[PDB]
Amino acid sequence: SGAIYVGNYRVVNRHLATHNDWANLVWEDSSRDLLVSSTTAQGCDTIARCDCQTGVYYCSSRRKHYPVSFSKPSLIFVEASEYYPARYQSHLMLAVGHSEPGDCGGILRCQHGVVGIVSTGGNGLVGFADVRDLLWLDEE
Ligand SMILES: CSc1ccccc1CC(=O)N1C[C@@H]2C[C@]2(C(N)=O)C1
Ligand SMILES: [Zn+2]
């Protein structure tokens, strides 16, 4: 579990969204595993606007932050899970690092701010849904 809180927005994995998230929906995209809902309080996270390929992510299954090198956002084939059939997920970045299903939501960040959130993984790999192209998160 985990979310990004920026402005009056809450960014979560779409497969972990609550009824309150759907009842206060701003935007959702199944192909990216992302959902954004509105909030009453203002958040403290800042979104990175950069081309970094190195950062640090939070791994709840180890209670630790790990430094990682990650690929550029791309269209990657993801295996069937209890949440989606086997399909291509877009805007996904991969890295070598520990991950388990419940690690989804952990933040990946660089010197500029939040880059994305854990969305996929397995066998020593971890995949992050990028949010750096969602410029509208910084306003309204
Ligand atoms: C950190 S996710 C993970 C890690 C190890 C093993 C298995 C998983 C779970 C997984 O394969 N998922 C979670 C989410 C539904 C997914 C997607 N974004 O298409 C794919
Ligand atoms: Zn950066």
UniProtKB/Swiss-Prot annotation:
List of catalytic residues: H15 (for protease 2a activity), D33 (for protease 2a activity), C104 (for protease 2a activity)
Residues holding Zn(2+) 1: C50, C52, C110, H112
Origin superkingdom: Viruses
Record field: catalytic activity: Selective cleavage of Tyr-|-Gly bond in the picornavirus polyprotein
Quaternary structure and interacting proteins, as annotated: Homodimer.
Free-text function comment from the UniProt entry: Cysteine protease that cleaves viral polyprotein and specific host proteins. It is responsible for the autocatalytic cleavage between the P1 and P2 regions, which is the first cleavage occurring in the polyprotein. Also cleaves the host translation initiation factor EIF4G1, in order to shut down the capped cellular mRNA translation. Inhibits the host nucleus-cytoplasm protein and RNA trafficking by cleaving host members of the nuclear pores. Counteracts stress granule formation probably by antagonizing its assembly or promoting its dissassembly.
The protein, known as: Protease 2A
Organism: Coxsackievirus A16 (strain G-10)
Lineage summary: Viruses, Riboviria, Orthornavirae, Pisuviricota, Pisoniviricetes
